[PDB]
């Protein structure tokens, strides 16, 4: 889902995948509904789209 219909990294990707798992900042008690994603999409996304 995250690869095909959200944001694709290329097959010959040269770069670092720097990411931290934060629970203090981006979590609201009741739900941060601002952050959003897609489940259904009729096209597999090419990289950097």
């Amino acid at each position: 889902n995250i690869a095909d219909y959200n944001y694709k990294l290329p097959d010959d990707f040269t770069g670092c995948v720097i990411a931290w798992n934060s629970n203090n900042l981006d979590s609201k008690v009741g739900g941060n509904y601002n952050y959003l994603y897609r489940l259904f999409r009729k096209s597999n996304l090419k990289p950097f789209e």
């Epitope: 203090n24 900042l25 609201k28 008690v29």
Partner: antibody
Framework: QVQLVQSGSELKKPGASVKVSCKAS????????MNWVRQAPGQGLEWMGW????????TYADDFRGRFVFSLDTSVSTAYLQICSLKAEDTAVYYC????????????WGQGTLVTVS | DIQMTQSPSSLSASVGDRVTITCRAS??????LHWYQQKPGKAPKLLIY???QSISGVPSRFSGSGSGTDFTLTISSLQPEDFATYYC?????????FGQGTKLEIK
């Protein structure tokens, strides 16, 4: 009406540990954050850290990472700060602030705990 | 880390005039800045949030505008009972930085 009462003017030794109060009323206490700022009389406001209102984790600012401890007591809407091992340079007031996780503006209303140390 | 400055430091004003105070940021805070007012011996209160919009429940003698690194508000009708130290507050990057202050004084 939303207002945040505070404790009286503390006056203790350089080396004791006291606990100021910030009691909340009127709004949803579990919605927003509970930031704290301090103000020296020869200086201005400095952001010093916030706490989440359901877990109570005390994340601090990058400058004062040490002796300061926030303690949350839920379902009473009290937001106590616990300063420990006071020094001679800590003769500053401490203001209470409601600053949420999404909007992050302070709006400091707080009467001012006159922490005089000698 | 934002060196947040404001000019002029101490300016005077009279009754019912149109004053303009500006406040400048080193880095881009493009649409997130808040304006505060602080009387001596009194806790502050929000005036203008996000540099354009205003809170309900404030006297609307003033309005705010600005983007980029240049931010201001214009008090279109000043009254002598203000005499207060005005503060800016951005909302873009940690740590959160205030301004030094523009204290208004009567002649």
């Amino acid at each position: 009406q939303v207002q945040l009462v505070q404790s009286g003017s503390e006056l203790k030794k350089p080396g004791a540990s006291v606990k100021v109060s910030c009691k909340a009323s009127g709004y949803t206490f579990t919605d927003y954050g509970m930031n704290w700022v301090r103000q020296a009389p020869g200086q201005g406001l400095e952001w010093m850290g916030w706490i989440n209102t359901y877990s109570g984790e005390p994340t601090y600012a990058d400058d004062f990472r040490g002796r300061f401890v926030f303690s949350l007591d839920t379902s009473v809407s009290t937001a106590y700060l616990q300063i420990c091992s006071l020094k001679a340079e800590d003769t500053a007031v401490y203001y209470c602030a409601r600053g949420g996780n999404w909007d992050w503006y302070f709006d400091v209303w707080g009467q001012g705990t006159l922490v005089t140390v000698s | 880390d934002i060196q947040m400055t404001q000019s002029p430091s101490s300016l005077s004003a009279s009754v019912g005039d149109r004053v303009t105070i500006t406040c400048r940021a080193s880095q881009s805070v493009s649409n997130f800045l808040h304006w505060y007012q602080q009387k001596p011996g009194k806790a502050p209160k929000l005036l203008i949030y996000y540099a354009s919009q205003s809170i309900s429940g404030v006297p609307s003698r003033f309005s705010g505008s600005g983007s980029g690194t240049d931010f201001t508000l214009t008090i279109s009708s000043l009254q002598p009972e203000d005499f207060a130290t005005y503060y800016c507050q951005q909302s873009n990057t940690w740590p959160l930085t205030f301004g030094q202050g523009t204290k208004l004084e009567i002649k």
